[PDB]
């Protein structure tokens, strides 16, 4: 019925390689700044919504308060120890609840927290909590 | 306070007092919201104004 008779705008990504380099530099800088902590927090396993995607699980935002309590810690301490906490998510699925509780137990058994006053034992930096605790399809 | 009340009343002349009533009635009017018919009248009035010739052309034609 009616045509587009005007002139478009153009966005060109000449800086694609430069921005990849910049993101890599920023990640290395942040790793040095927070060493020996990882670059990412521990995230929970979560079912995708809608009937198209509910057949698979993915990473969520943060562990439920109930899951943190079941794992045996408080939200404030978990946030300081490197665990994402999400207050607005609720549990109505015991499978997901159990998986997230076991996830937290394994993370606690696999990390070493240094004393806030004592001398630090030598410990190398592992960058990806995500890689060390991958989400697995049930 | 007959003295004070008459002093202020005569200053204004220079149940409720006159200064108060006039001040209140200046701002106690009714804001009935505009109606569709009046709005259409506004639009057509603007159209009539915008469809006028310029005075040069009007006066030249009138003189001819």
């Amino acid at each position: 019925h009616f045509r587009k008779h005007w002139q478009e705008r153009v966005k060109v990504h000449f800086d694609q390689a430069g921005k990849k380099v910049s993101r890599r530099n920023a990640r290395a800088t942040r790793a040095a700044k927070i060493a020996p902590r990882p670059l990412d927090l521990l995230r929970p396993v979560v079912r995708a919504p809608t009937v198209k995607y509910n057949r698979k699980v993915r990473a969520g935002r943060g562990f439920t308060l109930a899951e943190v309590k079941a794992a045996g810690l408080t939200a404030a301490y978990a946030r300081t120890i490197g665990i994402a906490v999400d207050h607005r998510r609720q549990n109505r699925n015991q499978e997901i609840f159990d998986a997230n509780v076991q996830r937290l137990k394994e993370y606690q058994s696999k990390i070493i927290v240094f004393p806030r006053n004592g001398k630090a034992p030598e410990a190398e930096q592992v960058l990806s909590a995500a890689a060390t605790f991958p989400i697995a399809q049930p | 306070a007959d003295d004070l009340e008459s002093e202020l009343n005569a200053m204004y002349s220079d149940n409720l007092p006159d200064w108060f009533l006039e001040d209140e009635k200046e701002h106690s009017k009714i804001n009935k919201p505009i109606t569709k018919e009046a709005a259409m009248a506004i639009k057509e009035k603007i159209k009539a104004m915008n469809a006028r010739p310029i005075k040069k052309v009007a006066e030249a034609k009138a003189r001819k």
């Binding site: 020996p36 902590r37 990882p38 404030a76 301490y77 946030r79 300081t80 120890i81 490197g82 058994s109 696999k110 990390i111 070493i112 927290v113 240094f114 806030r116 630090a120 410990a123 190398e124 930096q125 592992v126 909590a129 060390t132 | -």
Partner: protein
């Protein structure tokens, strides 16, 4: 010599002559000081003492 004499006359005073004050930039002179920028509330200070960011690692 004269400016240094005035400086020693004013040493330690709260208010100095503006020409003896640091120039920097208008915006830099309008910015909050370190003290004002560092002020925290009592509640936030208590939370910071109780739950600081921890130093941890992923090995065991």
């Amino acid at each position: 010599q004269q400016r240094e004499a005035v400086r020693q006359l004013y040493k330690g005073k709260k208010y100095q002559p503006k020409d003896l004050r640091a120039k920097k930039t208008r915006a830099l002179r309008r910015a909050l000081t370190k003290f004002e920028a560092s002020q925290v509330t009592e509640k936030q200070r208590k939370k910071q003492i109780a739950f600081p960011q921890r130093k941890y690692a992923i090995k065991a």
